[PDB]
Amino acid sequence: LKDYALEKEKVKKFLQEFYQDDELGKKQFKYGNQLVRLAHREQVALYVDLDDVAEDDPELVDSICENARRYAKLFADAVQELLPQYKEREVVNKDVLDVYIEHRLMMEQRSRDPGMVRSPQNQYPAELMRRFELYFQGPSSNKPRVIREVRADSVGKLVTVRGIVTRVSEVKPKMVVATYTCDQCGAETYQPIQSPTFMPLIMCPSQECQTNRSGGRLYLQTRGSRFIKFQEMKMQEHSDQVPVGNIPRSITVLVEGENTRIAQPGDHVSVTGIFLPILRTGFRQVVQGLLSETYLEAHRIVKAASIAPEIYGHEDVKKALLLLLVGGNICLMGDPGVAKSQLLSYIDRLAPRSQYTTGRGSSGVGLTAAVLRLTLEGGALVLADQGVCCIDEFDKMAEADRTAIHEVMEQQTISIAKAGILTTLNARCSILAAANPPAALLSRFDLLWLIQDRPDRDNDLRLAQHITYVHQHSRQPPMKLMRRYIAMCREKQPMVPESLADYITAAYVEMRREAWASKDATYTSARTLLAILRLSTALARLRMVDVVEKEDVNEAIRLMEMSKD
Amino acid sequence: AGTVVLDDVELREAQRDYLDFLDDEEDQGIYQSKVRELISDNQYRLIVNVNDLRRKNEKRANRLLNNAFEELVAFQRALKDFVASIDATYAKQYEEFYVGLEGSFGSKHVSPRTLTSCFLSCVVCVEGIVTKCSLVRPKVVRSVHYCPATKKTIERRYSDLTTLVAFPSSSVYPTKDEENNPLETEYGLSVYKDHQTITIQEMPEKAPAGQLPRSVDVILDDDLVDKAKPGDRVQVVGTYRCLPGKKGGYTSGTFRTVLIACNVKQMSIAKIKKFSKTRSKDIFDQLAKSLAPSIHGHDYVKKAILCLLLGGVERDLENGSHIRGDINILLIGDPSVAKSQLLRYVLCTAPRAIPTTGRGSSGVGLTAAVTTDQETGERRLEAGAMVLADRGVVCIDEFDKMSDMDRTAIHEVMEQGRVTIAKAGIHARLNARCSVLAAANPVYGRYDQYKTPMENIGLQDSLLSRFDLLFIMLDQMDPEQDREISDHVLRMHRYRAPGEQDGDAMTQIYEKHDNLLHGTKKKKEKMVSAAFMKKYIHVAKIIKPVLTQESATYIAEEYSRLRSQDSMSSDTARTSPVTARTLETLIRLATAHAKARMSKTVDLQDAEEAVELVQYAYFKK
Amino acid sequence: AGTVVLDDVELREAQRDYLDFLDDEEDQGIYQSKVRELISDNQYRLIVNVNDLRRKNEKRANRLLNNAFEELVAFQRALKDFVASIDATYAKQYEEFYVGLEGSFGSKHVSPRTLTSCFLSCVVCVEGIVTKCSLVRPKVVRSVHYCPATKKTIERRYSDLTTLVAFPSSSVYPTKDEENNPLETEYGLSVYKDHQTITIQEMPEKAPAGQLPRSVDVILDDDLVDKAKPGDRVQVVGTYRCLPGKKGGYTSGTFRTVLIACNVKQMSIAKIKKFSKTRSKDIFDQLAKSLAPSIHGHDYVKKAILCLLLGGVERDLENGSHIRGDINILLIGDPSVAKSQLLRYVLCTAPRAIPTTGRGSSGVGLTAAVTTDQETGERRLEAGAMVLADRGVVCIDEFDKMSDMDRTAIHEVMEQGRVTIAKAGIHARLNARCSVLAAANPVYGRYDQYKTPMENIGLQDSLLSRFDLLFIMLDQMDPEQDREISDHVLRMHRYRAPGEQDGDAMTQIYEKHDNLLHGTKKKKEKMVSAAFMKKYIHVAKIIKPVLTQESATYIAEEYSRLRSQDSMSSDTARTSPVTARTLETLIRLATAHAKARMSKTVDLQDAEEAVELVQYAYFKK
DNA sequence: GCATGCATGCGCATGCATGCATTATGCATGCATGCGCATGCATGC
DNA sequence: GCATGCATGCGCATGCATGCATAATGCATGCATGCGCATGCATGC
C-alpha cells in the first residue's frame, strides 16, 4: 500500500504538466485551458483520458483500474485544490447555487479567525461547494468485456462494455447533500447521502443550541440542497456473443449529470463504468451472510453509390431505395426465391435509425405502445421515429397491424384508445415493405416494384456466376462514407421555381390523358404528382442545387414509368 | 476463541488415508496428471470416482458415504497438501480447494420422490429437471476498510456457512473507528464469491402417472454458478442437510431440508485417417449402405439423411450478410413405408435431436415466447423447441397436420436461421440455426399415380422452395420385392440377443458378421459399427472444405441447363419449382459430399452426386 | 475475532526506532553484551537507562514517559526480535520478554504524597517503605484437558490483563465435552505464573512532621515475586493506572488507582594487590592511622574498630558445634571524648549498620516478636533490630541506661549468635550473627582515678566476659595536648569545601594533600581514600586465613602466663576477668590482623599485636 | 520482693459502599390464492 | 372473412406461519471500628 499524499501530488503535477496535443497542429496547454474554463461556469464536468496518463506512469493506471472510486475522489480533490490558482476573474453571470457558494465563503472569511480551534464537524462538506464532475475514459489497451462474464472478481474494477439499449428512465433529480436549518439559530447543518434511502434528522448539532440546550429542531430546505441528474439504463448482449442454445443476459447502468440524455432505447452503446454492489436488506433468504446486487456506474457513453452490391440486378430499385433513404413509402411484391428480405436487411443496417420486423413475432404490442411499471414504452414504429422502418412478409400480417401501418404512412401519427391507454404517438418514419403476390397497396403506397422471375437463360446464368463468385471468394466481383454523404445531403432544401410549374403541369395532364386512353390503367391522382415532386426535390437535394432542375423531373418520371410497367 | 485441539486419532488417520490414496507413485493412478491439468487450466476442484475409492479403501468410502462433512474437510486438506507439494506457488492463489464425486453410488441413487430423512447428512445422487433459477449474487468473505482521519486500514474476516451455527457477534459490518472516526469502505480490496439457487423437479417421464411432482432446492456456490439453466435435465451429487432457522423463542420443530451441490452433470485417430484415406468414395458408399440395417432399401433417403448429418458450411462476409448452410427434407409416401422408423433412428443417432409432431406443439412452443415476471415486473424470454435445437435436428412427424400460421413462423427459421421477438419493453434476435425432417401423408390417403404430384402434395410453392429436398415413396406390390421384404422382416423377428437364454421374458471399425442380421451371401462385405460411425461423423462435421474453380462453372452451367430443360421435360411433371435456392442447394450438397470423404477441396464427383440427387428428387414419372 | 490491522505508521516507526536503538554495532553501546549475559543467566528481562534513550532519541523518551503501554509493547516486540536474531533457540522458551527502566526521571520523581491523577498512564518513580505483603499465588495462563471417553486432548488460552478490558466470554474454565463427556484436568501440561501484592508507605523521615502518612498499592508479577519484604526501604518505577471495576449498572464514578511495577530497587584489582603486597604491615598501619581525620588520637580504639570491620572467621565442625567469630567492644569515658562521633562514623562506613540507643529500643524490638495474624488466625514472626542486622553492626549509645532484662536478652545473640523463639503453635531458631558497639558513661558522671574500675563501671562479671574488649578514655588537661586539640578543631572549623564561594549559605588510592585538613608537616605521608578503603575492607572480609602451628603454642603459653600473672599484677587493678573467652578473643584478633594484610596464614606478628591490645585494654594504672 | 499501673491484646456487634440475582408476551410481514376485468388468440360456418 | 368460444393473463384483498421488538429494582456481603474482658508485662517503694 502507498500513501495517498504522494499520489495526490503526482496527480496534481500530471494535471499541470501536459502540453503535447493540439488539433490545429501546434503545442497547446490543454489541461490548463480546461482548468481555466472550469474556474468559472464555462464547463461543468471534466473527462480524463487514461491513455495520456500511460505515457509517464502505468502503475498509476493499474491502481486506478483496480481501485477506481478512491482515485476518482482523489482526482476531484486535487482539481478542487488547483482551481483557485488558475482563477483570474470573478463570475460575469451567476445563478442561485453560485450565490449560495459565494455567500457561504464570504461569511466563512468574515467569522473564522486563523487561530481558533475548529471541530472536524464544523467544516463544509467537500462536494457541497464543488460544482465540477470528473469522469474517466477507458484505456485503449483494455479490451471490452462481455456482460455474461463480469462476476465477483470484477466488483470494484474499471470496465468497458458494449451492448444494446432496451430501457431508459426519465430524468429526475437525485439528492447529494441535504441542508437543514435550526428552529432557533442561524446555523446550517449538512447531511451527506451515500445510500438508496436515508433518515432525516431532528435535533440541531449547532454549538449555540448545544450551549443553550434549547432543543431546536431542524427543517429541510430544497434551495440549499445539492441535486444531480440521474438516469437508469438497461443493456443486453449482442446476438453474436450468446452461446449455443442460451438467451442474452442483461445488465443495469446508472448515469450521471452530463452523461444523462445521451442514449435512447434501441441504440448500440459502449460504456466505460465501475462495477459496484448494493447491499440488499429485505425478504429473508436461505443462505446467511451478506449478499448484494451488482450494478454499473457509467462515466462515458459513446454510441450513384452502391447499395447492397452483393445482390445482382435491380439497379432501378436500388436508385429508388437511395432516394427513399435521402428523402424529400416503397412496397416490393415478388415471387419466392428473389432476395427481397436481404434488401430490407441491408436497409436496416445502413440507416442510422431503423427497425426490422419479420411478421407475427413482433405483432400487436410489438407495434404501437404499452404501459409498464407507470411508464409508456413504444414499439418498433415508435423507435424508428425520424428513421426508416422495414417490414417483411407484409401480406401475412394481421388486419390490425396493417391498419396501423396505413395510419402511419398516411397520417404519420398513431392513436391508441384502450383501457388504460389514451395517447397519440408521433411516428415520422418512412416504410419499406416486402410481400408475395390488391387496390390498397396501389392507392396508399407511393411506389410499388413488382419483381417477376422470368427464366431467361442469360440472366439466370449471370446470376449463377455471381452467386458462385460470392460463395467462393466471399466478396462481390470488381457505409461510413454513404452515411456521411446522406447526412450532408439532407442539410439542404431546394425550392421549386414558378416557371417550371407550367411544364410540370403539362406533363401531369398528358400523363393522366394517357391513363384515360388506356382503360386497363388503374390509378392516377394528385398523389402521383406529389410523389413526383418529392422525388424531384430529393434528386435536387442530391445535386445540392437551390433550384429544382429539369433532369430531376425527367428521372422521377422515368422511375415512376418503370415502376408502373 | 482460544480453544484449540491437540490430538484427534480419527481425523489424522483419515487425512493420512487420503494422502496415501492420492499418491499415485507405485500404482497406475492418474490423479497426478489430473492435478497437473488443474494447475494448467487454473481450475480449483477435483472429481474422484467413488467406486475407485471403494476398491482401494472400502472403509473410507463407507465412512464418506455415511458421514460427509468431516470426510470432505479431510479431502480438502489433503488436496491443499498435495497441491502445495507439487507446486506451492499455485496454492497461494486460492484459499481452499474442493472435491467432486463420481461413480455408481448404488443404494444412494435416489429420486426426488424417494429422498427421505434417512439420508440426512450423507452424500446423495439425484436425477431431475431444472425449473427455477435465480440471478447471480455476490457475497462478502473478506472486508477491507480505510480511515482518512488516522490513515489506518483494517480487515475483517467472515465465515458463515463454514461453521454449522453462526452467532450475532459475527456477520457485523464495521462502520466506525474506535474513536468514532468514519471509515471508508474500499471495494477493490474486499473479497466476494458468487451465489445462486436452483430448483429441481422429478422428470415427468419417471413420475407415476396421474400423481403430482416433487421437487428439491439446490444451492450453487462460486464455481458452479453458470452450470445449470431452466428446462434442463441434470444429475446432482451432493450433501443433504437441514437449514438452521433464525433465532426465536418457540419453535414448531420442523426444519427445512436443502441439498448443497458438489457435482452437477449434464447427462448425455489412426483408424479414422487410414479408413478415410483408403476408402474415399467408399466412405460415403458404406455409410449410406450401413445407415440402418433395420430398414430395407431406400438408398436415396439414406443418402439425404447422411447429408443432413454432415451438413453444409456456414459462411459470413464483410457486410454482415449471412448465408444458410443447413439442409431440409420432406418425405411423402404411402402408409407402412417406415418413415417414422427413419425419424426415430435420426433422433437416436443425432447429438441434439428433438421430436415435435404436427399438433403436438403450436407456434408459440416452437420458437419462443415472452412472459412478464410477477416477482420483479420485468419481461423474460422463454425458448421454444427450435431455439433449444441450435445447430441440431428437429423432427416433425405428420407434417401435413400442422397449421398454416405455424409454417409461416417456421419460415423465419428455415430462411435465415434467426428468430426476431418483440413486445413493448423488450426486443431480441435469438439464434435458431437448425435442420428439419418432416414426413407428411398424401391428401388422398394413398398416393395417386395418375394425378400430378402438385395435387397430391397440396402445398404452396413458397413452402416447397423453403425445403431443400422432396422425396416420394411408394409401396409397389411386386411379388419378388414382397418376398425380399418378408425375408428381411422375419429374419429380424427371429433374431435374439446373444447371451440371453431362449424363451426368456423381458471397438472394431467393421461390425462382426451375423448369420441372420446379415446373411450368408453378405460375407463378402461388412457394415460399420455405430460408435465409429458417430466418431467419423463428428470429425467430418468439424472439417471445413473449400469449393474449387473446376466445379463452379460446371454447376452453374447445369443450373442453367435445368432451367432451360424446364421446357424440355414434357413426358414428366415437376415436384418442386426451380428457384435461386436450387443453386445454393447444389453447392450445399457438394460440400456435404466433400465432408463425407475427409479432404480439403470440393471436387467434381461430389457435384455429380448432388446433381444425381437433385434430378431424382425433382422429377417423377 | 477476525479483525486485523494492516498498517499503522506510529507503531511501525516506534518499533524501527527501538530496533535502531538496540543495535550497538557502529556505537560504543553495551546492550549486546547485556543480552548475552541474559542468555547466559536464563533471565528474561532487560533494564535500559532513560537518560541514555533521551540522549540518543529525545522524542522516543518523551513519548515513552508520556505514554507507557504502547511504547512498552513496542519495546517488548523489539526485544523478541533481537533475541531471535542473536539466538533464535533461546527465544523459544519464553512467550515474551520485558523491559525495566532506570535513570533520573526528573520531574516524574514523585513521592507517595505527591502522586496525582496528572501522572496517570505514565511511568513514575517512587521512594518508600514496605508495610504489607501477601502470599505468593499461582495464576492460570494456558489450560490443558483430556477426555478419557474420546481420547482427545484440548488446550485453552487465557489473557486477562494483556487486554485492557475483559468480557464474560473469556475466563471460563472448561469442564465438559461437546457431547457432555467429562474432561479430566491435567495440571502438568498447564501453565501458571506467580502473583503477589505489596503496599508502600512514605518514609517517616520524609513525611511532614505531625501529619498522617499516605500509601500506594503495588502488584508484583512472576519475576519480581521475592524481591520485596516488609519493613524495607525500596524505590519502585512503573506504570500508574486505573483499576476496572466489575460489571454493574450504577457507578459512583470513582476508580481505584494501582501502580504496576516494572522495576524494584533496594536503595544502597591490580591496585589492591600491589598495595597489599608492597605494604603488608603498613596496610593496617595506615588504615588505623587514616580511619577518621575528624577524630584526634585514640589509636587503640581505631585499631579495635578496624578489627570489628575486618572481623574473625566463623567455624563449624562435624558434630554441628558452632564457634563464634564476631568481636564486641565497650567504651567508657568522660564527656566530650567523641565516643558518639566514633559510633556515627562506624554507622556511615559499615555496610549494614543500625543504631539502637539505650532506652530507644526495648527487649522486644531488639530481637523479635510473635504476633497472631487476624486475617488468618495463624502465628507470624516479626524480626527485631538484631535479626535484621545479620552479619552486620549494631551501635548502642548510652549503653549503661539499658535495663537488665534487655542485656539478658542480648546474651543469646552475644554468645551463640542465634535467637530462640517459642509460643504455643510455633517455635523457631532465627539467625542473628552480629557485632556490637557500645558506649556507656561512668556512674559518677566523671571517671574517678583513685577508685578501681570495677566501682566505676558497675557491671557484673558475666556481661564483661561477654564483651571482647573494654576501653577507658580520659580527658587529661595537659596544656600541650589542649593546644593540639584546639589546633585540630579550629583547622577543621575554618575549612571550606572547594568549589563553594566564601560567605555562601547552605579514584586515586591516596587522598590528595590538603593544606589545612592535613598540614604542612604531613606532606611526607598521605591518607587512604574512603572508596578504596571500603573496597579493600570488603576484599579482606572475603579472604579466609588459616592459623599456623607456630603461633598456637605461643598464644597458649601467653594465656597461661596471663592467668599466672593474675597473682603478679599487684600495682594495678584489672578491668575485666580472664576466662576461657580470652583465648578465643586472642585467636579472633590474630585472624583479624591476618585479614588486614592479605595473605594465606596467620603469623606471629598478628598474635603479638593482639596480645599488645589485650594487655593495654585489660589493665590500667 | 511485693504491691500497683498500665500499654498491648482479643472477640462480636452495627454501618456503609459495592456487588449479586431475576426474567415471556404481544404485534408485524411476506407467501398463496380467490374474484372481477379487459385484451387477445384461435376456431368454426 | 365475419361471428363466436375460450384457454391465457393480470391486479388487490384475506389467512397463516415465522419473525421482530421490549426492557431497573431489590437484597446480600465484606471491610472498619466500638465495647467488655482476661492475661500479662513493666514500674515503683
Ligand SMILES: Nc1ncnc2c1ncn2[C@@H]1O[C@H](COP(=O)(O)OP(=O)(O)O)[C@@H](O)[C@H]1O
Ligand atoms: N439477385 C440475387 N443475387 C444474389 N442472391 C440472390 C438473388 N436473389 C435471390 N438470392 C438468394 O436467394 C435467397 C432468397 O431467399 P429470401 O430472400 O429469403 O426469399 P424471400 O425474401 O422471397 O422470402 C437468398 O438467400 C439469396 O442469397
Ligand SMILES: Nc1ncnc2c1ncn2[C@@H]1O[C@H](COP(=O)(O)OP(=O)(O)O)[C@@H](O)[C@H]1O
Ligand atoms: N423397408 C422396410 N423395411 C423394414 N420394415 C418395414 C419397411 N417398410 C415398412 N416396414 C414395417 O412396417 C411398419 C411401418 O410402420 P410406420 O413406420 O409407422 O409406417 P408409417 O410411418 O408410414 O406410418 C414398421 O413397423 C416396419 O417394421
Ligand SMILES: Nc1ncnc2c1ncn2[C@@H]1O[C@H](COP(=O)(O)OP(=O)(O)O)[C@@H](O)[C@H]1O
Ligand atoms: N579527639 C577529638 N578530636 C576532635 N574533636 C573532639 C575530640 N574529642 C571531642 N571532640 C569534640 O567534642 C565534642 C564531643 O561531643 P560527643 O561526641 O557527643 O561527646 P560524648 O559522645 O563523649 O558525649 C564533639 O563535637 C567533638 O567535635
Ligand SMILES: [Mg+2]
Ligand atoms: Mg423473404
Ligand SMILES: [Mg+2]
Ligand atoms: Mg408414420
Ligand SMILES: [Mg+2]
Ligand atoms: Mg555521646
Ligand SMILES: [Zn+2]
Ligand atoms: Zn440550531
